[PDB]
Amino acid sequence: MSLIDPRAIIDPSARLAADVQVGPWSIVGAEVEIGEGTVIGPHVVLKGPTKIGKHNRIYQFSSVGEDTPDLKYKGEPTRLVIGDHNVIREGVTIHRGTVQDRAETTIGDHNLIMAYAHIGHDSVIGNHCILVNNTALAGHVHVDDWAILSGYTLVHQYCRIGAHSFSGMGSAIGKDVPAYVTVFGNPAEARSMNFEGMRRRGFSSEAIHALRRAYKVVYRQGHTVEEALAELAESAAQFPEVAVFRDSIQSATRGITR
Amino acid sequence: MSLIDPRAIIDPSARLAADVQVGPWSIVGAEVEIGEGTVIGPHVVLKGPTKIGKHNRIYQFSSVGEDTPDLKYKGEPTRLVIGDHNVIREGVTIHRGTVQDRAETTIGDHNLIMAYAHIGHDSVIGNHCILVNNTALAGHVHVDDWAILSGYTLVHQYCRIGAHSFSGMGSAIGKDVPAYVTVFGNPAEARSMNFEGMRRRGFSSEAIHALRRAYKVVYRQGHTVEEALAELAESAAQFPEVAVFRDSIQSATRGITR
Amino acid sequence: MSLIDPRAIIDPSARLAADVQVGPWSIVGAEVEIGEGTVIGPHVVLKGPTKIGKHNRIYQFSSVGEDTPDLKYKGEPTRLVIGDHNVIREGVTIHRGTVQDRAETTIGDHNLIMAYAHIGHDSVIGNHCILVNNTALAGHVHVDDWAILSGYTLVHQYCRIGAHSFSGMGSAIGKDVPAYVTVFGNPAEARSMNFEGMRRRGFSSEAIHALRRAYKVVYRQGHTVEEALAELAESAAQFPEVAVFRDSIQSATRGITR
Ligand SMILES: CNC(=O)CN(Cc1ccc(-n2cncn2)cc1)C(=O)CSc1ccccc1Cl
Ligand SMILES: CNC(=O)CN(Cc1ccc(-n2cncn2)cc1)C(=O)CSc1ccccc1Cl
Ligand SMILES: CNC(=O)CN(Cc1ccc(-n2cncn2)cc1)C(=O)CSc1ccccc1Cl
Ligand SMILES: [Cl-]
Ligand SMILES: [Cl-]
Ligand SMILES: [Cl-]
Ligand SMILES: [Cl-]
Ligand SMILES: [Cl-]
Ligand SMILES: [Cl-]
Ligand SMILES: [Cl-]
Ligand SMILES: [Cl-]
Ligand SMILES: [Cl-]
Ligand SMILES: [Cl-]
Ligand SMILES: [Cl-]
Ligand SMILES: [Cl-]
Ligand SMILES: [Cl-]
Ligand SMILES: [Cl-]
Ligand SMILES: [Cl-]
Ligand SMILES: [Cl-]
Ligand SMILES: [Cl-]
Ligand SMILES: [Cl-]
Ligand SMILES: [Cl-]
Ligand SMILES: [Cl-]
Ligand SMILES: [Cl-]
Ligand SMILES: [Cl-]
Numbered sequence: 001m002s003l004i005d006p007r008a009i010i011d012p013s014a015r016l017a018a019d020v021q022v023g024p025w026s027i028v029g030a031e032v033e034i035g036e037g038t039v040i041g042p043h044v045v046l047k048g049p050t051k052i053g054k055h056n057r058i059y060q061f062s063s064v065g066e067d068t069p070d071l072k073y074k075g076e077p078t079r080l081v082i083g084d085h086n087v088i089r090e091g092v093t094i095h096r097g098t099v100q101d102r103a104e105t106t107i108g109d110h111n112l113i114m115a116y117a118h119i120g121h122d123s124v125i126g127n128h129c130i131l132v133n134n135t136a137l138a139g140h141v142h143v144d145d146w147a148i149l150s151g152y153t154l155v156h157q158y159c160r161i162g163a164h165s166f167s168g169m170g171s172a173i174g175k176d177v178p179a180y181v182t183v184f185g186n187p188a189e190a191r192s193m194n195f196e197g198m199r200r201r202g203f204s205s206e207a208i209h210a211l212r213r214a215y216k217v218v219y220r221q222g223h224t225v226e227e228a229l230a231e232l233a234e235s236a237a238q239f240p241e242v243a244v245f246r247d248s249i250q251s252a253t254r255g256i257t258r
Numbered sequence: 259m260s261l262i263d264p265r266a267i268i269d270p271s272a273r274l275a276a277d278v279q280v281g282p283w284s285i286v287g288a289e290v291e292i293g294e295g296t297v298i299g300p301h302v303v304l305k306g307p308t309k310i311g312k313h314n315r316i317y318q319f320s321s322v323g324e325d326t327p328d329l330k331y332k333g334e335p336t337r338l339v340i341g342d343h344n345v346i347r348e349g350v351t352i353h354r355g356t357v358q359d360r361a362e363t364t365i366g367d368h369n370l371i372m373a374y375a376h377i378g379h380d381s382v383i384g385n386h387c388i389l390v391n392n393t394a395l396a397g398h399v400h401v402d403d404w405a406i407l408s409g410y411t412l413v414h415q416y417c418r419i420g421a422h423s424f425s426g427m428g429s430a431i432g433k434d435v436p437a438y439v440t441v442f443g444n445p446a447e448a449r450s451m452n453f454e455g456m457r458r459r460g461f462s463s464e465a466i467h468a469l470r471r472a473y474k475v476v477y478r479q480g481h482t483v484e485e486a487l488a489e490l491a492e493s494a495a496q497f498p499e500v501a502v503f504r505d506s507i508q509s510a511t512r513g514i515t516r
Numbered sequence: 517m518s519l520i521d522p523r524a525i526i527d528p529s530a531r532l533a534a535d536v537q538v539g540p541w542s543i544v545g546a547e548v549e550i551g552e553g554t555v556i557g558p559h560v561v562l563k564g565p566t567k568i569g570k571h572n573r574i575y576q577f578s579s580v581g582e583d584t585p586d587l588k589y590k591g592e593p594t595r596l597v598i599g600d601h602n603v604i605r606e607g608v609t610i611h612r613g614t615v616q617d618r619a620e621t622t623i624g625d626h627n628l629i630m631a632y633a634h635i636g637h638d639s640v641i642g643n644h645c646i647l648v649n650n651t652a653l654a655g656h657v658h659v660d661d662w663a664i665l666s667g668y669t670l671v672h673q674y675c676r677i678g679a680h681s682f683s684g685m686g687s688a689i690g691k692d693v694p695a696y697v698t699v700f701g702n703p704a705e706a707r708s709m710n711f712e713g714m715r716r717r718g719f720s721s722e723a724i725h726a727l728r729r730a731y732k733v734v735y736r737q738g739h740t741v742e743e744a745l746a747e748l749a750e751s752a753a754q755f756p757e758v759a760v761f762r763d764s765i766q767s768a769t770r771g772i773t774r
Contacts, residue, residue: 009540024267025283025541027558042285043301043319043559045576060303061319061349061559061577063606090321090351091374091577093606093631093649115321115351116374116607116632118649133351133376133394136649136667138685151394152412154668154685169396169412170430170444172686186444186686186702282525283541300543301559301577318561319577319607348561348579348609349632373579373609374632391609391634391652409652410670427654427670428688428702444702 005042014048023060032065035084049077050096053084053109062092068105068121069095076100083109083127090115097122103140126163144179144248146197162248164201166194176252178218179244180211183257190219190257198241207241214242218249219258225249263300272306281318290323293342307335308354311342311367320350326363326379327353328397334358341367341385348373355380361398372409384421402437402506404455412444420506422459424452434510436476437502438469441515448477448515461499468497476507477516483507521558530564539576548581551600565593566612569600569625578608584621584637585611592616599625599643606631613638619656630667642679660695660764662713670702678764680717682710692768694734695760696727699773706735706773714757723757730758734765735774741765 004010007024016034023042028034031048037055040046044058050065058064068078078096081104092113097105105119108127113119117131120139129143132151137143141155144163149155153167162179172186180193193215198208214235218228229250236243249256262268265282272290280286281300289306295313298304302316308323316322326336336354339362346352350371355363363377366385371377376394384403391409395401399413402421407413411425420437430444438451451473456466472493476486487508494501507514520526523540531549538544539558547564553571556562560574566581574580584594594612597620604610608629613621621635624643634652635641642661649667653659657671660679669683678695688702696709709731714724730751734744745766752759765772
């Protein structure tokens with residue numbers, strides 16, 4: 001019968017587009033905004049200030065928009081922003097981040113965040129990412145587009161997870177993961193690149209070839225990071241996809257996973 | 259108090275035996291069937307098409323019968339079947355599986371699926387199994403009778419867990435685990451055989467001895483798998499419990515955990 | 517707004533201080549006692565016999581006071597006791613323990629038990645401890661004061677975790693961790709001591725020095741545990757912090773994490 005179930009609790013300051021659905025026993029707290037086409041399941045807790053975009057789905061037992069730990073001071077404004085076409089499965093926890101220092105927690109578009117995954121404060125997820133069951137981002141974690149974190153992947157605070165990268169199940173990531181790289185184990189170790197994912201995306205053969213060579217430059221020829229960046233310079237100018245790889249290594253603050 | 263709490267939602271398509279109990283704020287969805295003596299706690303989400311048998315117990319915050327990701331086409335029929343005398347603890351997630359290709363998700367009888375454990379699509383659990391807290395079966399996983407997967411055990415798609423086998427806590431299983439074998443670590447490694455389980459089952463002392471010999475044949479004498487199967491043939495003809503072990507090795511598709 | 521939400525269920529045997537808050541769709545079961553200033557969120561399940569103290573916060577989807585597995589006999593009395601100023605985040609599970617053999621499950625004061633963490637039967641946690649997300653104590657685990665168990669730390673039954681000790685993310689602890697010791701990995705290995713924590717607690721620089729020397733006596737000088745205890749004796753009599761360390765090694769029942 002009604003799009004907003006009568007058993008849900010909707011705070012008067014929440015703002016919901018006219019077609020939003022909310023299931024029974026869900027709570028949509030103060031300062032939570034929900035855009036067109038989004039479906040909130042039953043037994044969902046939403047807390048704000050939080051903006052959720054269009055055409056999202058949030059499943060049962062999720063807590064989205066929770067308090068950030070250790071604020072600089074009491075009542076520093078925080079925020080969580082979720083874009084469009086995302087799926088947040090059961091039991092997921094997502095915390096807000098601080099606004100003043102531009103460290104909101106942010107999730108882009110077309111992401112899949114699977115059961116019991118955890119998105120810690122100030123983390124930023126791009127587009128078309130997949131965080132499989134029980135993945136946990138500790139805090140201040142940046143996950144660039146098309147990355148796949150397999151089940152039970154744990155990510156240390158401040159780590160960057162490169163575009164189109166891949167972690168194996170149960171991986172424990174302490175350092176940055178360069179774009180395209182595949183990591184496994186606890187502690188995580190680089191193995192290869194996700195050539196599969198490149199093909200599914202339609203990369204040319206020449207760019208794949210140039211990425212395979214780039215992997216060897218960084219990981220298999222005894223170079224220092226500095227020497228590898230200088231050697232990749234030329235290929236990175238020719239192939240935007242190698243520039244993605246090179247740029248991910250240059251902006252690494254915690255060293256790269258090796 | 260009524261057996262179906264008045265605050266629970268029971269879909270007009272669901273079919274329940276007359277003595278079934280359902281707690282407050284629980285949803286028994288469309289196309290769910292629940293047999294005699296089952297108790298559903300509070301805050302449970304059941305979705306279908308799902309058959310739950312007799313004398314089961316399903317605890318709070320569990321999502322039992324969720325959607326399979328792996329559909330060939332929109333509305334391909336899918337199903338989850340749970341047998342009798344099972345206990346499904348809090349927070350457990352169980353996905354359905356496809357009917358057409360005989361790949362339904364199936365759980366037999368007398369199983370214990372402990373908190374936050376995850377049973378992915380198309381998986382098949384036998385009888386008298388224990389999946390400890392946070393165990394995850396990614397998909398297409400077969401758990402044979404009496405197996406124990408210790409807490410936080412992660413199992414790769416398509417793996418077979420043999421009868422009476424055991425995994426140590428935090429194990430990450432990528433290959434098949436032969437019957438009776440104990441495995442540990444990330445990545446998992448074979449260590450020994452579950453002699454304790456054998457004695458709790460009543461095995462004769464000759465059969466336990468033959469199984470200890472069989473472990474060494476496969477794992478300690480430098481034999482190939484082909485060589486080991488040939489050498490086990492004789493003992494397997496004498497002892498049904500050694501045939502279990504031999505048969506588990508012969509039907510391995512991902513290699514055996516070593 | 518009423519302190520006890522009209523949608524919560526409060527068993528007539530439960531005993532609450534007058535100012536206790538209890539959110540919608542929460543169950544305070546039989547034999548649950550709750551003290552002054554404690555706040556129970558929505559969607560919380562409390563079962564007894566369980567005592568919760570003063571100024572505690574228990575978040576959504578938590579099951580606090582659950583049954584102990586395999587009691588000596590049906591209806592052997594069990595209990596869980598939680599002290600004051602504790603925070604129990606979402607999805608946390610805490611089981612009771614047996615009363616007769618002094619094995620209740622007990623939690624002291626000023627503890628932070630983060631999302632989806634698990635406290636198994638007969639476990640004892642002191643004061644000012646942090647169990648990060650998804651930390652799991654299997655059963656009969658003792659956690660001394662100021663310990664920090666990072667996310668996804670798994671603890672085998674009967675282990676003791678010493679005061680001021682630290683585990684890295686994803687650690688799988690199978691033996692005792694001495695006080696102050698930092699451990700990492702699956703299986704866990706000792707790396708150093710938590711000198712940071714000592715500084716934040718205000719230890720004198722002479723006591724930190726004596727603890728650094730004590731670490732080397734146990735771990736870096738080829739001594740047996742017996743030898744090391746004899747050599748530490750003198751410093752332990754002079755510094756109460758080194759006695760903490762020595763006493764944690766002497767009372768180890770599963771060997772120490774090395
Ligand atoms: C189906 N493929 C796998 O399950 C491999 N995989 C990566 C992965 C997983 C799922 C997806 N998608 C789901 N909907 C769309 N995409 C994509 C890649 C794992 O993480 C395995 S571990 C694991 C897996 C599931 C639960 C618990 C655990 Cl531990
Ligand atoms: C009591 N034995 C253990 O706790 C050993 N165990 C195997 C095991 C565990 C339980 C059972 N049963 C429970 N009811 C009946 N059987 C049987 C074997 C583990 O998985 C340890 S780890 C762990 C354990 C519990 C929670 C989280 C974690 Cl991480
Ligand atoms: C901020 N520090 C860290 O996040 C480091 N940490 C220890 C730690 C963590 C939190 C706290 N507190 C929170 N409120 C007060 N204290 C203190 C120490 C981890 O366990 C990282 S792993 C992890 C972290 C969080 C979620 C999932 C995972 Cl997997
Ligand atoms: Cl909108
Ligand atoms: Cl999921
Ligand atoms: Cl956080
Ligand atoms: Cl993997
Ligand atoms: Cl790879
Ligand atoms: Cl692929
Ligand atoms: Cl792309
Ligand atoms: Cl039935
Ligand atoms: Cl679903
Ligand atoms: Cl459980
Ligand atoms: Cl699934
Ligand atoms: Cl073993
Ligand atoms: Cl009190
Ligand atoms: Cl009590
Ligand atoms: Cl006691
Ligand atoms: Cl938390
Ligand atoms: Cl327990
Ligand atoms: Cl760590
Ligand atoms: Cl350290
Ligand atoms: Cl320091
Ligand atoms: Cl102190
Ligand atoms: Cl020892």
